[PDB]
Specification:
CoA-Trfase_fam_III (chains A, B); alpha/beta; about 40% helix; homodimer; about 425 residues; CoA-Trfase_III_dom3_sf (chains A, B); Rossmann fold; binds coenzyme A
Chain lengths: ~425, ~425
């Protein structure tokens, strides 16, 4: 019946993942999202990591559902004219091109404001405007390195490690999305748009907040009691890599289940929750550990925590990961299996919840995407195909007032060049 | 002058990180956020990982800036009365307690709706309502395991690995935040609140979208051309662990810089951007690689990509990471240093950008927090101290109509029990 953003007009001047992820969600909340793409090639994701010759890649289809596509060279005087008219009629413009790119076309925040003082301008960059790295190009892992994630992820005796999760890309997109929605609410009171910027470095940092917590702890005490280097190894000046440690106030580890020698996902994540120690003891057949002072409190457990994980793993290694969780959760233990992407892709509850979603794409047939991650009692998004390149050029030009001949003339002229 | 959410009243019925992260941002956007905490202990984070005896832990102070605290036992008939009055006057209630917890107090979505049909109810859980894991407890890494991150992060010959980034916690908080803001906009049209749910598993999955992309690629072709196992190793049924691979359409790796033998952060992230190959060649003194067909295209590079990273590392290993980036970025290469948490905590540009922020906490003095990650041209949040336990009980009760004697009587009675 109604959606949060019905009537909102969005200009999607974006590429790759960070920007497109934000705008796809805008479309899913009911906005009309017009992706503005360079003529003939469009969004780089259309052609990266193709699994079928000549059609849009999954990279593109999974990030651009529910959008309209117009082909437009904004470096041409004509492209600029159309662009200006689109900005005049739009509520939101999002861009995530390299530092300086859109300014050099002449769509500076300052100018955009003059065309449309109700427009909310959303901009993603690698880094903040006062960063020494302000003009640096950033892909996913560059941000993961700049943002403290790579330094803190992996093992103490291994290199910094990148996370599979898009900390730099979709995460940055989610963060801009928050700002854009907040600007929409703010405009309800002021009557004015504003500019919202988000850096990929800052998105990564936001998710690494508890590591800035631990840095302060470590500056003050010289050790981190729950980290694996305590009490037998060594702390340096910086928060170290912790392996599969819990990262919070509840120790845990990634434990081997049956099949691990061969199946890289034959594992669970097991949490030793402080207030569930007794149950945990009952789960693993160590009732004696309920009152033994070397085990009865977390503080007592810590110095020999790996001997505890080792005992638990003596159990988990013997059954299938799904059975281990089936058993262990009856004792109210926080655990789950390490689900592979294959398992996720076929899970019926994720289908049922609208988290993994099938979509019919022209020319390609069916694909899977991740759906709208949060669930609303008042509406449900309908996740639709991604646009073919320039599929809506004509429609979007007619909406701007261009006649059929005008449209035909601009395409012809373009073809003729 | 004005903030996005001025006038919005929020009930923060949350603990730990996922829920509190969402509500802290609400306060930073101008909402009045009332944290509702059990009498005498409050949010578990107040007492976890303390670095100073008897005062609120950094865990708490970094997640609860700008909030008011009321102590309230919502299991008592009296606690329930106050609670109901708070829900009557509030715009948003957020909760992230264990599955079943708030229902069993009698604040079921259904009832909340009857008290206040304009209230937006926000709820975080480990898993979705139709999940077989709906009643399972979830901390950070349990979600990272359930959501595909752990399966896909780390090395091919190592265990699944957790990410330092809060994929399960603050990330889930950010996602609910998006829903809550979208519900606020929706209520501007319908006059009605609604319920917004977010699972930690689904937050993790959203960030692992490109891994569901790769799962489909792999189902279709049986190999992933840009992954390290191509072409000399082996693919199984599931997307594998890739080490420090780029994760997208632009190969990369984590490279050693001078000091690595001793300093676990003496490294960069280096991207081989397809459209910058020539520059890259010039950067490393391999101009011959510009036209050599074994190197001139990405497709040609892939089968011997590690011999290329090895050559680049022959350079990076000789200088300090900061100098390596200083040099390499003049050639427009995407790279950054792996910044340690220590470096981040002291970085002047992050101070300047309001990303790392100093706050004065009563009894503790100064601490560092991560500030409001997105930047707005129309306002700037003022990041303030976190509340002491029950600091605002009296004020919040007076706002509800309770008299001074009433307040004094409820505290006395509580003390007397
Ligand atoms: C991802 C990134 C590094 C890619 O950089 P890149 O491929 O070298 O350059 P871009 O795709 O941004 O821009 C290429 C050109 O296309 C141009 N362009 C974009 N849309 C166009 C259009 N509709 N018509 C004409 N030109 C267009 C840009 O202006 C640029 O031209 P210029 O070099 O003359 O200024 C860069 O866009 C970036 O750092 N973005 C900000 C951070 C970000 O979001 N990262 C991506 C994470 S998924
Ligand atoms: C984090 C989590 C696992 C912790 O579980 P836990 O410590 O065993 O249990 P909780 O803190 O949720 O609840 C403990 C009790 O406090 C009660 N409680 C909470 N606030 C209260 C208040 N103001 N007054 C009285 N009781 C209160 C709860 O109802 C519960 O009582 P019950 O067992 O009789 O139902 C759980 O809250 C959870 O899975 N939350 C959902 C997912 C999530 O957000 N995870 C945290 C990621 S940072």
């Amino acid at each position: 019946l109604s959606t949060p953003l019905q009537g909102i007009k969005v200009l999607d001047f974006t590429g790759v993942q960070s920007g497109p992820s934000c705008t796809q969600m805008l479309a899913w909340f009911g906005a009309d999202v017009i992706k503005i793409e360079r003529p003939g090639v469009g969004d780089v994701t259309r052609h990266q990591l193709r699994d079928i010759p000549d059609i849009d890649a999954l990279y593109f289809t999974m990030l651009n559902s529910n959008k309209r596509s117009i082909e437009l060279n904004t470096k041409t005087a004509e492209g600029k004219e159309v662009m200006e008219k689109l900005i005049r009629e739009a509520d939101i413009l999002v861009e995530n091109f390299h530092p300086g790119a859109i300014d050099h076309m002449g769509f500076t925040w300052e100018h955009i404001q003059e065309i449309n003082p109700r427009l909310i301008f959303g901009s993603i960059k690698g880094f903040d405007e006062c960063s020494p790295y302000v003009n640096v190009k950033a892909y996913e892992n560059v941000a993961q390195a700049a943002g403290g994630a790579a330094s803190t992820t992996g093992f103490w005796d291994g290199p910094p490690l990148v996370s599979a999760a898009a900390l730099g890309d979709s995460n940055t997109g989610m963060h801009l999305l928050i700002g854009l929605l907040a600007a929409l609410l703010h405009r309800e009171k002021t009557g004015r748009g504003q500019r919202v910027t988000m850096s990929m470095q800052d998105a990564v940092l936001n998710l690494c907040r508890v590591k800035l917590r631990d840095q302060q702890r470590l500056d003050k005490l010289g050790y981190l009691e729950e980290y694996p280097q305590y009490p037998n190894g060594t702390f340096g000046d910086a928060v170290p890599r912790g392996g599969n440690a819990g990262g919070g106030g509840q120790p845990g580890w990634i434990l081997k289940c049956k099949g691990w020698e061969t199946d890289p996902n034959a594992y669970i994540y097991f949490t030793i929750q402080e207030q569930n120690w007794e149950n945990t003891c009952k789960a693993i057949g160590k009732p004696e550990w309920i009152t033994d002072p070397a085990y009865s409190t977390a503080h007592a457990r810590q110095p020999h925590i790996f001997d505890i994980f080792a005992e638990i793993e003596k159990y988990t290694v013997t059954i299938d990961k799904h059975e281990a969780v089936a058993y262990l959760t009856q004792f109210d233990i926080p655990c789950a299996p390490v689900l592979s992407m294959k398992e996720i892709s076929l899970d019926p509850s994720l289908r049922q919840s609208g988290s993994v979603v099938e979509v019919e794409q022209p020319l390609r047939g069916k694909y899977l995407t991740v759906g709208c991650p949060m669930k609303f009692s008042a509406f449900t998004p309908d996740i639709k195909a991604a646009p073919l390149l320039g599929e809506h050029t004509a429609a979007v030009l007619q909406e701007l007032g261009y006649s059929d001949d005008e449209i035909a003339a601009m395409k012809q002229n373009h073809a003729i060049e």
